[PDB]
Design a protein around this ligand. Structure first.
Ligand SMILES: Cn1cnc(CNC(=O)c2cc(-c3ccc(F)cc3)cc(O)c2O)c1
Ligand SMILES: [Cl-]
Ligand SMILES: [Cl-]
Ligand SMILES: [Cl-]
Ligand SMILES: [Mg+2]
Length: 213
């Protein structure tokens, strides 16, 4: 089997069904003790939690679900009725993410879409009945952060106050995105320094709040 299958199985056998916190703890334990994986992790996860709680977004888009760690993290803190859409281009990972959400009991709050974000973003308004997004979590291929941000704007999915939160702006880094948002009058940016998941290596999140045209 794959690392991702092994992570899912560990959760199923070491967490309590319907208990998202136990799911996060199980993944963190597995990835610290057994096999590293590119989940956002606890250090950066705590920063994400603080941001989610500050904004209480009604509609969140995540780019890059992977195994669903961040989707569980965010969805567990959403208010009743609030929703998460998460995109994952790898079908095997999309299936892991669905099963992870199912186990966590969060499947009614989250929709996991299998496809490249550049292909799905233009369908959000008509197919998924989206008006604008309250928050976007970027965690997919690092060279897609900038083009997909520009695509979100083109498609009319950003509003004044839409919070972009980007993982991995130090490692692996996303230099074009980071330069762009920090240099743009349409974004107000804040850097949250942290650590790479499960590693004593500096990383960070960037929050970029959209200001309109
Ligand atoms: C498999 N996959 C398909 N798309 C993606 C998008 N994400 C990343 O590439 C990603 C990578 C790293 C990372 C990898 C190696 C390393 F040495 C240090 C950091 C960490 C993350 O948090 C990430 O999100 C991953
Ligand atoms: Cl994650
Ligand atoms: Cl993608
Ligand atoms: Cl961590
Ligand atoms: Mg990441």
């Amino acid at each position: 089997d794959t690392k991702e299958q092994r992570i899912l199985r560990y959760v199923q056998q070491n967490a309590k069904p319907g208990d998202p916190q136990s799911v996060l703890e199980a993944i963190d334990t597995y990835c610290t003790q057994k096999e590293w994986a590119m989940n956002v992790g606890d250090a950066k996860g705590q920063i994400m939690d603080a941001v989610i709680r500050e904004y209480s977004p009604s509609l969140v888009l995540e780019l890059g679900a992977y195994c669903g760690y961040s989707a569980v993290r965010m969805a567990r803190l959403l208010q009743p009725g609030a929703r998460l859409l998460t995109m994952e281009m790898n079908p095997d990972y999309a299936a892991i993410t669905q099963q992870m959400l199912n186990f966590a009991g969060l499947q009614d709050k989250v929709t996991i879409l299998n496809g490249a974000s550049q292909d799905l973003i233009p369908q959000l308004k008509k197919k998924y009945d989206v008006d604008t997004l309250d928050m976007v979590f970027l965690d997919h291929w690092k060279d897609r952060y900038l083009p997909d941000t520009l695509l979100l704007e083109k498609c009319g999915l950003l509003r004044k106050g839409t919070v972009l939160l980007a993982d991995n702006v130090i490692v692996p880094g996303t230099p074009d995105f980071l330069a762009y948002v920090r240099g743009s009058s349409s974004f107000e940016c804040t850097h949250y320094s942290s650590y790479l998941e499960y590693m004593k290596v500096v990383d960070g999140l960037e929050k970029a709040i959209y200001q309109g045209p």
